[PDB]
Amino acid sequence: RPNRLIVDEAINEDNSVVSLSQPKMDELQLFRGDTVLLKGKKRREAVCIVLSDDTCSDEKIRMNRVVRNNLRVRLGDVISIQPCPDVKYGKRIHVLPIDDTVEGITGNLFEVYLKPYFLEAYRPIRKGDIFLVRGGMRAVEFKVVETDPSPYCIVAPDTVIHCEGEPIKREDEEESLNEVGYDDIGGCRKQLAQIKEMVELPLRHPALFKAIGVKPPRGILLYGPPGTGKTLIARAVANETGAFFFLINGPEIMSKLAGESESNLRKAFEEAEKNAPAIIFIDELDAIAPKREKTHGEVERRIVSQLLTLMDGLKQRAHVIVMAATNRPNSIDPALRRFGRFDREVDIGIPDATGRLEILQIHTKNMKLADDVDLEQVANETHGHVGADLAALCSEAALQAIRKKMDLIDLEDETIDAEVMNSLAVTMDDFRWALSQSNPSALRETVVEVPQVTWEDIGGLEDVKRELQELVQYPVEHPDKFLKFGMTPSKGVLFYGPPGCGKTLLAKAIANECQANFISIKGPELLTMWFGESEANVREIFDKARQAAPCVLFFDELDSIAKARGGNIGDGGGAADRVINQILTEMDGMSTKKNVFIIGATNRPDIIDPAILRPGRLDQLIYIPLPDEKSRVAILKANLRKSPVAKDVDLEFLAKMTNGFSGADLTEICQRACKLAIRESIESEIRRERERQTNPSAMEVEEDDPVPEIRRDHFEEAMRFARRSVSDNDIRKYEMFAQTLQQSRGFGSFRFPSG
Amino acid sequence: PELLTMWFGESEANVREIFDKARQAAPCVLFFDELDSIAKARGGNIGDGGGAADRVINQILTEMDGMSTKKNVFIIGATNRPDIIDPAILRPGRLDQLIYIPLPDEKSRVAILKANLRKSPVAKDVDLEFL
Ligand SMILES: Nc1ncnc2c1ncn2[C@@H]1O[C@H](COP(=O)(O)OP(=O)(O)OP(=O)(O)O)[C@@H](O)[C@H]1O
Ligand SMILES: Nc1ncnc2c1ncn2[C@@H]1O[C@H](COP(=O)(O)OP(=O)(O)O)[C@@H](O)[C@H]1O
């Protein structure tokens, strides 16, 4: 029966869309823009407009929240769709605003909300429906309580609208909107899908899996920075799927006087079990269940034991599911990890770049913005923030925008109308001012992401590029060849050469190309850890790396550790021993199933311990040659890609004269030339100012002042202060180590043996 | 590396539990690795874990002296730098029987080659002797 359709989540947010595939259009021979009749649960009736969408399957109907609530149904149910061509243009419509939707407006609903939303829409409406309208910066619901014809009718230009009277009393099963939904979350699509897949089935079908007799999960942990929306996620899931959300807070429990707390806890569970399949969310667990050594008195231990017993004693039976929110999965007591206890754990990573953009779009939805708005730049510059941070920044930007208009917006009072405040076009001045008074929260926090470094960013070292491609991409792309041959790919790769010159650039480029997460470990912070934490810290670092598989781990200046071992002190070597032992133990603990490459950059391979250089550890050593002519030319071109042009010299000529210079030196030379150009522009502007004061308002057009390009004079200025970063003895020692390696693997030519 | 980690702090209980676990699983063959790492850290530019290393080795010696001949559990130690080893280990009752491992050659090389060359893609190969 290709007429009943299973309702699911939708893509179009318009109030009058039911999405059908083109074969479905062919099936019923329906028109586009025609009204169709929808029948569902609670004996509800709806009228809607058919729209085209090839994403939905033939048996799938895509349809938003407003009309889904109009039928008083949720996703996953079955509805009946039929043609309704007998609809005709409406005559009069009397609507009535909801009580808690128009507070603090004092305006003409016709000329701000009714006129634009109802314009050229032709949305069919039936008596009893509720429709939401976006406004200046608020969204307001209206309930159509009378219409001609009744109950179903067509919104037409020849309709008189009456929206005067006492607000209608709130309904009961109307499933009031303005609640959190799946769309209301940005930047966490992967985790959202992961949690949706393994939670929806037991709740939507409490008896189906019971008939299957497969034990569902009972406890899920969510950990991350505070204020990232974990409570928001839980509330949205409860609202969307349909459940009996029951929130309990740890500080509330701690506020009570001992025993009743536990009783309250008991009450909570006996509340949820008797109210059908329900969902329980508990927050700030470490605040009530920290590590047992952190626990000092006996009351907290009693509470912990009580909650453990309560949660274990409800093993399945009732379909209640509980999740918890915390900061990190390393502060709570470890006993809350057993089978049947909290076992499935999820991290909520910091939104970055794109996710920040969707967060802004979600928050910057209602208030009207100026055409100057450039959200992409804001998302680029803003990092180390959370959804709450961006919401606060948007709030303060709106406050600044309104504040500067007191004279125009009648600073006194007189209950400013909606259209007057509508004029507050948000400007980049407001955003910059808000950013001036801005404070991030994450800051000193590890970030896992995919960098955006391209292959053309470097001279190329095409042999090394191909070798790394062979090492990484093919093993995961085509495991069949290895499993047939029985070869296990290596894991630890090391680089050595002049300081810098692409190492980190190579790591970022390969991470970007392979489309895998990147984790960086720095020598300075390594030595910071070196005093104190040396065993646990590596443990959670590698646990985090394992969780983000597939990913690539990078180590910067590993020899710095041996720099403490071999240096001007040579006395704190116990910590270095601890670090090395931890690293080796973890490397031996790395299973072959995990696909995580490890890269290490070392300037001096000789000082470092050769014990690392063994099978099952870092084995592939790649030398870094100095940039040479064409490589230098490409590097200079990449540097010049920023803004100015160098159409006054010969780049390869300069490379010829500047042999033996690292790419870092070339970038520094470019920066010096840029500084000279900036100073030239500044002095040209100063001369313009001087001639302005000598003759007021003489001439103000743009003179031949330095615009973005590097003239030759700047080039001599830059080349004069050119640095030979690497001394010859450094090349001597690099080639000494290379020849040491070659002598071991030394077999002069061949003779085609066994011929 | 695990032993060197156990040098600082958690040493006594680990040794006791590992020897007890070996003892209850009799008969068994306890094995050791990096037996020269203790002496490698004993003499060098670190000079930090020497006290912990000496404590660990003393504990090991005492506990292995503490076993009863009833338990049919054997002990095997391996190293590649035997000179740096403390003579106290090379004592009666302690490790006394010593075996040198000569490098493979020809017959040994061909044997290890033909023992490791299982794989799926054997091709048809050539003479292992000249290899
Ligand atoms: N992806 C997002 N989309 C929309 N709003 C978001 C998002 N992430 C965070 N927010 C906002 O940040 C705030 C987070 O609120 P809330 O305290 O409920 O979150 P939380 O992460 O569960 O908090 P907690 O610190 O208690 O663990 C809210 O104002 C919410 O609107
Ligand atoms: N376009 C480029 N081509 C090649 N090398 C580059 C380019 N841009 C920057 N580099 C190199 O990247 C290096 C970064 O240095 P640094 O991060 O301190 O050491 P490492 O690269 O070993 O991590 C610089 O020394 C510079 O020479």
Swiss-Prot record, chain A:
The modification N6,N6,N6-trimethyllysine is found at residue 294. It comes from Homo sapiens (Human). GO terms for molecular function: ADP binding; ATP binding; ATP hydrolysis activity; BAT3 complex binding; deubiquitinase activator activity; identical protein binding; K48-linked polyubiquitin modification-dependent protein binding; lipid binding. The modification N6-succinyllysine is found at residue 647. The keyword Ribosomal protein does not apply. Its main location: cytoplasm. Homohexamer. Forms a ring-shaped particle of 12.5 nm diameter, that displays 6-fold radial symmetry. Part of a ternary complex containing STX5A, NSFL1C and VCP. NSFL1C forms a homotrimer that binds to one end of a VCP homohexamer. The complex binds to membranes enriched in phosphatidylethanolamine-containing lipids and promotes Golgi membrane fusion. Binds to a heterodimer of NPLOC4 and UFD1, binding to this heterodimer inhibits Golgi-membrane fusion. Interaction with VCIP135 leads to dissociation of the complex via ATP hydrolysis by VCP. This is Transitional endoplasmic reticulum ATPase. Keywords: Acetylation, Amyotrophic lateral sclerosis, ATP-binding, Autophagy, Charcot-Marie-Tooth disease, Cytoplasm, Disease variant, DNA damage, DNA repair, Endoplasmic reticulum, Hydrolase, Isopeptide bond, Lipid-binding, Methylation, Neurodegeneration, Neuropathy, Nucleotide-binding, Nucleus, Phosphoprotein, Transport, Ubl conjugation, Ubl conjugation pathway. The modification N6-acetyllysine is found at residues 481, 484, 647, 733.
